[PDB]
RNA sequence: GUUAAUGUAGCUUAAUAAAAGCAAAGCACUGAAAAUGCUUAGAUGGAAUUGUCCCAUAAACA
C-alpha cells in the first residue's frame, strides 16, 4: 500500500485555446474528484509556425482511482490534443516565523 | 485539512448566525438580553412556465406583480398568522388576555370616513390622527347570515 | 467523448481574426483549429 | 473447484463522433464573439486547394461504414471503444464468453491477464495493465466454476489473421446484451464504459 | 437587440443541455465507481486475501501516454 | 429616545438600529424580513408564500426581489415601521438585485435608514 | 415462494403547522482555482410512528 507521486500532463495542442479549455475543464473533473492541482504552468512556443502546450500539475492519485481517472481522460480528451503523463522531477513572513519556533 | 474549506464569507455568515440562536453550554448574549390543492398549485406553476409571454417579460426585467391580488390572497391563505405576530409584538396578546394567545380568523375591516370618498383604512399598527377618527368607522367583516358576533373598541 | 472539450470560445483577451481550417493527418484524421490567414485545409506531410 | 480467468479488453475510439445541431449552433456563437473580439487572390488558390482536400479520401471517422459487419476486425468502431468477445466451448456449456485462460493462485492476476491478450488473439496486439485489482467475478453452475473478469486498453493493436475460425467480435455495448444473456456474462457493461 | 435575444434562447437550450449531460456523467462516474468498488467487493467474498497483495499500487505502471 | 446597541465595535454588522433588514438569496428562493433587536420578526415576506408564487414566474431573480421588495414595503407601510437599516455587504450592495429591491422601498417610503437616537 | 434487497431530486432522520435546505450546471470575469454577478434543473412510484407492513422493483435460495 503506497501512495502515487504526483504526475504532470503536458497537454500540447495546436490551438493553446482549445488546450486552455481542456487544462481548465480536466481541472475541474480533477476538483470535483478532489485531485489538487498545485500549478497550471505552460510552456513556450515550439519556434521552427509555432504550437502551443500546457502544464497540468496533477498531485495525489490511488491505484483504483488511476484506473478509471486516466480511462475517462481519453474520453474526455478532445479534438486534435495530444496527451502526456509523467512523474514530475519564497516563503513569506508567516511561513518563516513558524519555521523559526519550530528549529528554535 | 479533512473538512474542506467554506472559501465564501456568506456562507460562514450564515452558519454563524445559526449557531448563536442554538443553545449553548456557555454564557450567551441571548440569555442576559389537501394534497389535491398541491397537485392544483403545480398545474398552475406548470401554465405559467409555459407561457413564453412571462419568460419575455423576466427575461427583460420588465414583469411586474399585481400586489392588490397578493394582498387578498395573503389575507386569506396564511396572512393570520403574521396578524399573530404583530398582534404578539405590541403585545395585544400579553395585555387584554393576560398571555393567552387566539388566532384572528376574520379578515376583518375598518375604515374612517373623511368627507368623501376617501377611507382610511385601519390595518395593524398604522398611524391615524385623532381628527380623522372623529365619528365612528365603517366596520366589514363577511359575517355570514345566522351569525351572532360582538365588536369592540 | 472528444465533443466535451470539442467547442470552446477563445479566452485570450487580445487577439486577430482567425478562420477555421482542417489539418489533415498522415493516418487520415482531422481536426478543427484556428488560423489567421483564410486557409481552408492543412496537410501533414 | 474450476479456476478460470477471463481478460474484458478495451480499445480507445479513434474518432470522435459529430457534434449535435445544438453543439453547431453554440459552435457559431463563440466565432461571432471572436469576430467581435477580432482586430483586422490567395482565396482562389485557398479554394483550389480546399477542392483538392475533398477530392483526396481523407480517414473515415468510422471505418464500419464500408465494412459493416467485420466483427472480426479490430476496427469494428471508431466512435466507441471496443471490447474482446471470442466464442468458446466449454465441457458442460457453448456460450459466447469474453476472453477465457487458465490461471493459477501462483500466477498474479495480471500474469494471466498478460497471457489472455496474446493466447486468444496471437497477433501482435499492445495492451496495457493499470491495476492489480479485477473487474469482474462471476460464478455459474451445472460442479462449481468461477471466471476472473479483468480490464486492459488496447494501446494499439497489428490484428494479424483478421478471419479467424473463430467468432472473435470486438463490440462496445449492442454485441454485449445480445451475445450474452445471463446476468453472469450480460453484467459486464456494469464495469464497462 | 432581437438578434441578441435570439442567441440568448439558443444559450437556454445549450446551457441546459450542458448540465444534463453533467448530471448525466456524474451519473455515470458513480455507476463506474460502484461498478469498480462493486469488483472490489465481489473477490473479496471469494478471498480477502488475494486483495492484500492487489490492493497494494503498481509503480512501474506510469509513465503512460495516450493520445 | 429607547436605547439602541451601540457596542460591537470589533464585529461586523453593528447593532444600533431598531430595526434590520435581512435579505437572504437561498438557492431557489428569496427571502425578506424585518426583526427587532430582541429577535422577533415583524414583517416577513418570502417567495415560498403560495399568494406570490402564483403571480411570480420565477423564485429566485432579479424582478422577484424586486417584486418581493415592493410586498415588504407594504406590509412594513401597514405595521407603521417607517424607519430601518439594512447592512448589506459590499458585494452583496453592488449587487443589481438588491439595489432595484432598495429601489422599491425608497419608492414605497420606507426609510432605510434611521434617525440617530434624542438624548 | 424462502432469504435479501429498494421506495422524497446528488445529499438530509427537511416537512406534515408548508413539498424545504445543501450539493450541482451554465454564463460574465481571465493567471488557474475560488469568490462575486446574471441565470438553470429536477422528486414523495409508497403507508404507517418515532428522534414495520406495503405493493412495485431486482437479486442469492429459487
Given at each position: 500500500?503506497?501512495?502515487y507521486?504526483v ?25 470535483r ?8 504552468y ?10 502551443h ?11 483504483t482511482?488511476?484506473?478509471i ?15 502526456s503523463?509523467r ?18 | ?13 450564515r452558519?454563524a ?27 398552475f406553476?406548470?401554465?405559467?412556465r409555459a ?9 427583460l ?18 396572512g ?19 398571555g ?6 376574520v379578515p ?28 365612528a ?17 | 467523448?472528444?465533443?466535451?472539450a ?5 479566452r ?24 489567421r ?9 | 473447484?474450476r479456476?478460470?480467468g ?7 475510439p ?14 457559431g ?13 490567395a ?16 480517414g ?11 466483427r ?36 498474479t ?13 496471437e ?9 492489480n ?5 462471476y ?8 471466471v ?22 470486438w ?13 453472469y ?5 456494469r464495469?464497462?464504459? | ?12 437550450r ?37 486483495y ?16 | ?28 428562493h ?14 416577513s415576506?418570502?417567495?415560498?408564500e ?7 414566474y ?8 424586486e ?10 407601510l ?13 458585494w ?5 438585485s438588491?439595489?432595484?429591491?432598495q ?17
Open positions: 500500500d503506497y501512495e507521486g504526475l504532470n500532463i503536458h497537454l500540447t495542442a495546436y490551438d493553446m485555446s482549445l488546450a486552455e479549455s481542456y487544462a481548465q475543464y480536466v481541472h475541474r473533473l480533477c476538483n474528484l478532489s485531485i489538487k492541482v498545485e500549478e497550471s505552460a510552456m513556450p512556443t515550439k519556434t521552427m509556425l509555432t504550437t502546450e500546457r502544464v497540468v500539475q496533477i498531485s495525489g492519485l490511488s491505484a482511482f488511476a484506473e481517472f486516466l480511462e475517462v481522460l481519453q474520453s474526455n480528451l478532445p479534438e486534435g490534443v495530444r496527451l503523463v512523474e514530475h522531477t519564497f516563503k513569506a513572513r508567516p511561513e518563516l516565523e513558524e519555521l523559526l519556533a519550530k528549529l528554535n | 485539512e479533512r473538512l474542506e474549506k467554506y472559501r465564501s464569507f456568506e456562507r460562514y455568515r452558519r448566525e445559526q449557531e448563536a440562536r442554538a443553545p449553548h453550554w456557555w454564557r450567551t448574549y441571548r440569555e442576559h438580553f389537501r394534497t389535491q390543492k398541491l397537485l392544483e398549485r403545480k398545474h406553476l406548470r401554465e405559467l407561457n413564453v409571454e412571462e419568460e419575455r417579460a423576466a427575461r426585467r420588465t414583469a411586474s406583480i399585481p400586489l392588490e391580488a397578493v394582498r387578498a390572497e395573503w389575507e386569506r391563505t396564511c393570520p398568522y403574521h396578524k399573530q405576530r404583530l398582534a404578539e409584538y405590541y403585545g395585544l396578546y400579553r395585555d387584554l388576555f393576560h393567552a394567545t387566539f388566532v384572528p380568523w376583518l375591516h375598518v375604515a374612517y370616513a373623511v368627507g368623501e370618498e376617501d377611507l382610511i383604512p385601519v390595518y395593524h399598527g398604522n398611524e391615524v390622527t385623532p381628527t380623522e377618527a372623529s365619528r368607522p365603517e366596520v366589514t367583516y363577511e359575517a355570514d347570515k345566522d351569525s351572532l358576533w360582538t365588536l369592540l373598541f | 467523448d472528444c465533443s466535451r470539442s467547442l470552446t470560445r477563445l485570450r483577451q487580445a487577439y486577430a481574426r482567425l478562420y477555421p481550417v482542417l489539418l489533415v493527418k498522415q493516418d487520415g484524421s482531422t481536426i478543427h483549429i484556428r488560423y490567414e483564410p486557409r481552408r485545409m492543412l496537410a501533414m506531410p | 473447484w479456476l478460470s477471463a481478460l474484458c479488453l478495451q480499445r480507445p479513434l474518432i470522435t463522433k459529430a457534434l449535435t445541431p445544438l453543439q453547431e449552433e453554440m459552435a456563437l463563440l466565432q461571432q464573439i471572436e469576430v467581435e473580439r477580432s482586430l483586422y487572390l482565396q482562389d488558390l485557398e479554394d483550389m486547394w480546399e477542392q483538392a482536400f475533398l477530392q483526396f479520401r481523407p473515415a471517422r468510422e471505418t464500419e461504414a464500408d465494412k459493416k459487419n467485420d472480426t476486425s479490430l476496427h469494428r468502431k471508431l466512435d466507441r471503444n471496443l471490447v474482446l468477445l471470442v466464442r468458446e466451448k466449454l465441457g458442460d456449456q457453448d456460450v459466447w464468453m469474453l476472453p477465457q485462460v487458465e490461471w493459477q493462485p501462483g500466477e492476476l495480471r500474469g494471466t491477464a498478460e497471457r489472455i491478450l496474446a493466447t486468444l488473439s497477433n501482435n496486439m499492445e495492451a496495457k495493465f493499470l491495476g485489482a479485477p473487474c469482474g467475478h460464478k455459474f453452475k451445472f460442479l462449481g466454476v468461477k476472473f473478469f479483468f480490464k486492459a486498453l488496447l494501446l494499439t493493436g497489428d490484428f494479424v489473421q483478421a478471419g479467424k475460425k473463430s467468432r472473435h467480435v463490440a462496445s455495448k449492442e454485441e454485449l446484451g445480445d451475445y450474452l444473456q445471463p446476468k456474462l450480460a453484467q459486464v457493461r464495469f464497462l464504459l | 437587440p432581437e438578434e441578441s435575444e435570439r442567441r440568448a434562447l439558443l444559450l437556454k445549450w446551457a441546459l443541455f450542458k448540465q444534463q449531460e453533467h448530471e448525466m456523467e456524474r451519473d455515470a462516474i458513480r455507476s463506474m465507481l460502484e461498478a469498480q468498488q462493486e469488483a472490489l467487493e465481489e473477490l473479496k467474498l471469494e478471498s480477502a486475501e488475494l492484500a497483495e492487489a490492493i497494494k499500487r503498481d509503480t512501474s505502471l506510469f509513465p503512460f501516454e495516450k493520445e | 429616545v429607547a436605547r439602541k446597541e451601540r457596542g460591537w465595535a470589533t464585529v461586523w454588522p453593528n447593532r444600533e438600529f431598531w430595526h434590520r433588514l435581512r435579505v437572504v438569496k437561498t438557492q431557489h428569496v427571502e425578506a424580513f424585518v426583526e427587532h433587536l430582541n429577535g422577533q420578526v415583524v414583517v415576506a418570502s417567495t415560498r403560495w399568494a406570490i408564487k402564483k403571480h411570480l420565477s423564485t429566485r431573480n432579479v424582478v422577484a426581489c417584486s418581493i421588495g415592493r410586498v415588504l414595503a407594504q406590509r412594513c401597514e405595521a407603521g415601521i417607517n424607519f430601518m437599516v439594512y447592512q448589506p455587504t459590499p452583496e450592495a453592488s449587487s443589481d438588491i439595489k432595484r429591491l429601489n422599491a422601498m425608497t419608492e414605497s417610503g420606507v426609510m432605510l435608514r434611521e434617525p440617530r437616537r434624542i438624548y
